[PDB]
Amino acid sequence: ETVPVKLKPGMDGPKVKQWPLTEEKIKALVEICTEMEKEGKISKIGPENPYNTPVFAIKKKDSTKWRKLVDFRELNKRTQDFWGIPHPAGLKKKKSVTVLDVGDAYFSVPLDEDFRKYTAFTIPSINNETPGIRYQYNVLPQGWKGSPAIFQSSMTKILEPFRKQNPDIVIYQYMDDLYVGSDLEIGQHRTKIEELRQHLLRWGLTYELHPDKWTVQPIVLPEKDSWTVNDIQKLVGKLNWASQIYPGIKVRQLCKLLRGTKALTEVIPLTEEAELELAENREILKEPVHGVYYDPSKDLIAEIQKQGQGQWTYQIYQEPFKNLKTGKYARMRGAHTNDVKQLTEAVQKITTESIVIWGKTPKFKLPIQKETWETWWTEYWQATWIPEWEFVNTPPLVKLWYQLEKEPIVGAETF
Amino acid sequence: PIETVPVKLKPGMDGPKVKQWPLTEEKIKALVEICTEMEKEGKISKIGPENPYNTPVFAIKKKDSTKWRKLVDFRELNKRTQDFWEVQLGIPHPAGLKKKKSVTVLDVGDAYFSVPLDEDFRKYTAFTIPSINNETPGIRYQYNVLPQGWKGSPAIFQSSMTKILEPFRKQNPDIVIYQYMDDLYVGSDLEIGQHRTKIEELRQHLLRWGLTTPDKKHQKEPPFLWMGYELHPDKWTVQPIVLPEKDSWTVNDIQKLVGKLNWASQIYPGIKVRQLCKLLRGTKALTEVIPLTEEAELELAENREILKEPVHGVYYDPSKDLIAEIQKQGQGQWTYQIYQEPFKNLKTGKYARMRGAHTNDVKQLTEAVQKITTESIVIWGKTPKFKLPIQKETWETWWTEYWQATWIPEWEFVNTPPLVKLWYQLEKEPIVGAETFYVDGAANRETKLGKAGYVTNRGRQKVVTLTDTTNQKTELQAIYLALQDSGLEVNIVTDSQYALGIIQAQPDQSESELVNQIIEQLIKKEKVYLAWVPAH
Numbered sequence: 038e039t040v041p042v043k044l045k046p047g048m049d050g051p052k053v054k055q056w057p058l059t060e061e062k063i064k065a066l067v068e069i070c071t072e073m074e075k076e077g078k079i080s081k082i083g084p085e086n087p088y089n090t091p092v093f094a095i096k097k098k099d100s101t102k103w104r105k106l107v108d109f110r111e112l113n114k115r116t117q118d119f120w121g122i123p124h125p126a127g128l129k130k131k132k133s134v135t136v137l138d139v140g141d142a143y144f145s146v147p148l149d150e151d152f153r154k155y156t157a158f159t160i161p162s163i164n165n166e167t168p169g170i171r172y173q174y175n176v177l178p179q180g181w182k183g184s185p186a187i188f189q190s191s192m193t194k195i196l197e198p199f200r201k202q203n204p205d206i207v208i209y210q211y212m213d214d215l216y217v218g219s220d221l222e223i224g225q226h227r228t229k230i231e232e233l234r235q236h237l238l239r240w241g242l243t244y245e246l247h248p249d250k251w252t253v254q255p256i257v258l259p260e261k262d263s264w265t266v267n268d269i270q271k272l273v274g275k276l277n278w279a280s281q282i283y284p285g286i287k288v289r290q291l292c293k294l295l296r297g298t299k300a301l302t303e304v305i306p307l308t309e310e311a312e313l314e315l316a317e318n319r320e321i322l323k324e325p326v327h328g329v330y331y332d333p334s335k336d337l338i339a340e341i342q343k344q345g346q347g348q349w350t351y352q353i354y355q356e357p358f359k360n361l362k363t364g365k366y367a368r369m370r371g372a373h374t375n376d377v378k379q380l381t382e383a384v385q386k387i388t389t390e391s392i393v394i395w396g397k398t399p400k401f402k403l404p405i406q407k408e409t410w411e412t413w414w415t416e417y418w419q420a421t422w423i424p425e426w427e428f429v430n431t432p433p434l435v436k437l438w439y440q441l442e443k444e445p446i447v448g449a450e451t452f
Numbered sequence: 453p454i455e456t457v458p459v460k461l462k463p464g465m466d467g468p469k470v471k472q473w474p475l476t477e478e479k480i481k482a483l484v485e486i487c488t489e490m491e492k493e494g495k496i497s498k499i500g501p502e503n504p505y506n507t508p509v510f511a512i513k514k515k516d517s518t519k520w521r522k523l524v525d526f527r528e529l530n531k532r533t534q535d536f537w538e539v540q541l542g543i544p545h546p547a548g549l550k551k552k553k554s555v556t557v558l559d560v561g562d563a564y565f566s567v568p569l570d571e572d573f574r575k576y577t578a579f580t581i582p583s584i585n586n587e588t589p590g591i592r593y594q595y596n597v598l599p600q601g602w603k604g605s606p607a608i609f610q611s612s613m614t615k616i617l618e619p620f621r622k623q624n625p626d627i628v629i630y631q632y633m634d635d636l637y638v639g640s641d642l643e644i645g646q647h648r649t650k651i652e653e654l655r656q657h658l659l660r661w662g663l664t665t666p667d668k669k670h671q672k673e674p675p676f677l678w679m680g681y682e683l684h685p686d687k688w689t690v691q692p693i694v695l696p697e698k699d700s701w702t703v704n705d706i707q708k709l710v711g712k713l714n715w716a717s718q719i720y721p722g723i724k725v726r727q728l729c730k731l732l733r734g735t736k737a738l739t740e741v742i743p744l745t746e747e748a749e750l751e752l753a754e755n756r757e758i759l760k761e762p763v764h765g766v767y768y769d770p771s772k773d774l775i776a777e778i779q780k781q782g783q784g785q786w787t788y789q790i791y792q793e794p795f796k797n798l799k800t801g802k803y804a805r806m807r808g809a810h811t812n813d814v815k816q817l818t819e820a821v822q823k824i825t826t827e828s829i830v831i832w833g834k835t836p837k838f839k840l841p842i843q844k845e846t847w848e849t850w851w852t853e854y855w856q857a858t859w860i861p862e863w864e865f866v867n868t869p870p871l872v873k874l875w876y877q878l879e880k881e882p883i884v885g886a887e888t889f890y891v892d893g894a895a896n897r898e899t900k901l902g903k904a905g906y907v908t909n910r911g912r913q914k915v916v917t918l919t920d921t922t923n924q925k926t927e928l929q930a931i932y933l934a935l936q937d938s939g940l941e942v943n944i945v946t947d948s949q950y951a952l953g954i955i956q957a958q959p960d961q962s963e964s965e966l967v968n969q970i971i972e973q974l975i976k977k978e979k980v981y982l983a984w985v986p987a988h
């Protein structure tokens with residue numbers, strides 16, 4: 038049957054414009070759509086339906102098969118609340134997690150007839166020689182929040198049998214995804230996961246994370262045989278900024294060593310007073326600031342800064358300077374000449390963790406131009422979900438600071 | 453016999469109830485005539501007292517026959533009608549169309565009046581033919597089809613057409629049909645006979661659905677006018693644009709002119725309006741007559757010459773490469789032209805001098821590239837391979853170190869000066885040997901009086917008092933002088949947060965003349981090392 042879904046009081050349906058797509062892309066979407074139409078999942082619609090939602094094709098890893106993806110971000114935000122599952126804190130303390138796209142089961146369930154208009158989407162034609170191919174959903178659409186929700190009963194239902202068979206494992210459902218965390222070693226782990234898939238396949242369905250390795254990393258200060266006027270200068274600026282976080286940090290003694298109009302390259306002998314001040318700071322920095330706890334009733338935020346050479350840094354927080362986590366990202370083999378790719382890849386990676394840890398997506402502040410992003414992000418996207426974002430200008434200091442984060446001695450030795 | 457579309461009011465508003473404008477026995481008698489005809493064609497229907505809605509009808513005589521025609525002012529009804537999905541606002545672009553053996557345009561003229569109205573909504577389209585100076589009840593009617601001027605009509609007509617064509621299209625894949633307004637543009641690669649034959653079949657098909665099609669008199673023939681373009685199935689040509697020679701130019705004349713010129717700037721290489729724009733300075737009225745300077749008269753003459761050149765073009769062939777070449781036409785301006793085969797261009801164009809707050813060339817090149825890319829994806833659904841007047845080394849060095857993410861698709865270098873390059877590069881580390889300038893500027897933001905100066909490790913010093921300045925300005929001027937009075941290598945320190953910006957961004961253009969100056973000085977130095985330090 039169909040449960041009566043509605044829009045939040047006074048909300049109207051999305052009417053978002055279809056961004057232009059690639060030919061390759063339009064071909065696949067058409068293909069896809071005809072099939073679904075045939076399968077009865079979607080129907081062509083009339084002009085009396087003024088709504089719209091963007092759409093696009095992504096790549097299902099390992100296959101040439103293009104995956105259909107819709108931008109339900111607006112609909113989701115306009116869809117009423119169902120007053121999801123409580124986040125299993127244990128998940129983050131698991132040795133290895135794996136994700137699965139269980140969005141496929143949604144088709145099985147019908148969508149309330151009165152809500153379908155709001156599912157209106159469109160297939161564009163190159164050079165707009167042809168009008169858009171309008172459709173609307175008849176079933177549960179993937180990437181829509183209401184789907185995993187309506188599908189809960191059935192979901193949990195099919196799940197139990199495995200959960201009991203293996204109670205040491207934790208399963209979490211976010212949108213179209215399923216993240217499974219266990220403390221079993223790689224093989225026994227994946228075998229058990231496949232065992233899960235088989236289990237899921239007898240109905241109709243179808244990343245290797247390691248949360249416990251997600252170390253909280255500190256800020257390491259430079260150490261030198263000798264220090265120059267400039268060296269110190271840079272150092273002072275950084276710590277002076279740093280004081281907004283750890284108010285115990287002090288640069289007074291150092292600032293006295295900066296008294297005098299000397300050559301930037303000239304060496305300054307460190308006073309013991311200044312030297313203590315430095316060690317006191319190293320001590321403060323040695324650990325994350327106190328009193329920081331995650332607020333479930335507050336928007337989660339994620340900022341990123343392009344560090345260069347394929348390197349990047351991020352800070353998830355809810356209050357400025359009050360970070361829940363900070364980390365870095367190195368470009369993945371192959372992305373060497375593409376900035377957008379490395380970026381999208383990161384946004385995804387961060388987002389996954391955000392889900393894994395607090396069970397939601399952060400809101401991104403991206404060090405990139407809107408036009409650059411919009412024009413090429415889809416090309417490298419891979420997640421069923423799409424997080425919220427804003428484009429920003431990176432304050433030079435913030436970057437400089439986090440650039441100071443500590444890295445391994447040698448690294449995670451993969452013998 | 454076509455399925456009506458379900459139409460509703462807004463949000464719960466009400467149908468229009470505007471009163472009928474008073475007309476003369478003459479204007480009335482004409483409307484009475486046309487409406488009896490429409491009544492019989494089945495387009496409208498006489499109603500009675502059961503209708504409070506109404507729209508004003510009017511009587512105008514057109515040129516074609518000077519014959520009395522009619523018009524119904526739907527403005528209100530329209531503002532009360534629900535919203536529909538956007539009608540095709542993105543029209544095809546000539547450069548994107550493909551070349552065809554033949555192309556025919558069919559005119560589904562008053563097809564608006566061919567599609568049935570949603571029987572329910574019909575009462576809202578009610579209007580009234582007045583009586584001789586408000587005598588007893590005038591004649592009442594309502595539409596039963598898509599009204600000329602009514603809000604829904606366009607999107608509806610379009611859809612209707614789309615279904616009706618689905619069959620035909622499915623049957624002959626090798627036939628392309630374009631819908632625009634009341635025009636069907638059918639082309640092919642078939643033999644003209646086969647083609648003309650299929651045209652007929654298609655027509656007949658329409659006929660089945662009541663879709664009356666052309667009379668040889670109204671028949672349009674190639675080439676076709678697609679806003680600024682004349683299209684022949686073999687190729688396109690840009691319409692010969694005319695600049696009138698006069699001895700009296702109003703501001704209007706100059707603006708309109710500048711406009712037309714600007715449009716041509718996309719196609720024709722060489723156009724300029726600098727001296728023309730200049731004439732607009734301090735204008736007091738549109739009807740104001742501004743005499744052309746010698747320079748104005750000159751460029752106007754050069755332009756007439758260029759405009760008398762036949763710009764002809766090529767269509768899109770999906771089997772060949774899509775190529776885009778760019779030229780930096782002076783600072784902030786970029787020219788591009790997309791061709792698959794040398795000298796045979798599909799599209800060309802240039803992007804205006806984007807007067808921003810502060811950037812650089814490489815960034816600007818990038819932004820041009822993207823604008824282009826976007827256009828391409830819409831036009832051909834493919835991005836063109838790029839030929840760029842910048843070295844791959846310049847690219848690598850800039851991008852790999854910039855604070856903001858950026859990217860240029862698959863591209864290739866083409867040495868067509870001027871080439872874009874980095875005007876300077878702030879040092880990575882302070883310079884050993886070079887002098888150090890500890891700069892500083894302070895101004896009272898309220899008295900706008902300030903001073904700026906420096907003290908070097910070498911002994912040199914200076915201060916300069918400034919009136920009608922700002923603190924930001926001073927800080928900068930400090931830096932300016934620093935560069936001015938320094939040799940080829942300079943180490944400058946400052947607490948100006950903005951300079952931090954310049955360290956990160958290293959712009960080579962800015963909205964601020966001052967900054968610009970500094971840039972000039974920067975570019976001039978053999979080496980410069982900026983270092984920022986917290987103030988106070």
Ligand SMILES: CC1=C(C(=O)Nc2ccc(Cl)c(C(=O)OC(C)C)c2)SCCO1
Pocket residue numbers: 166548549550551552554555628629630637638639640674675676678683684685
């Ligand atoms: C011939 C053809 C198509 C085409 O790709 N080229 C193409 C080539 C020349 C013309 Cl004149 C047209 C045409 O229909 O004119 C438009 C600009 C109004 C289209 S698509 C629609 C059907 O016909």
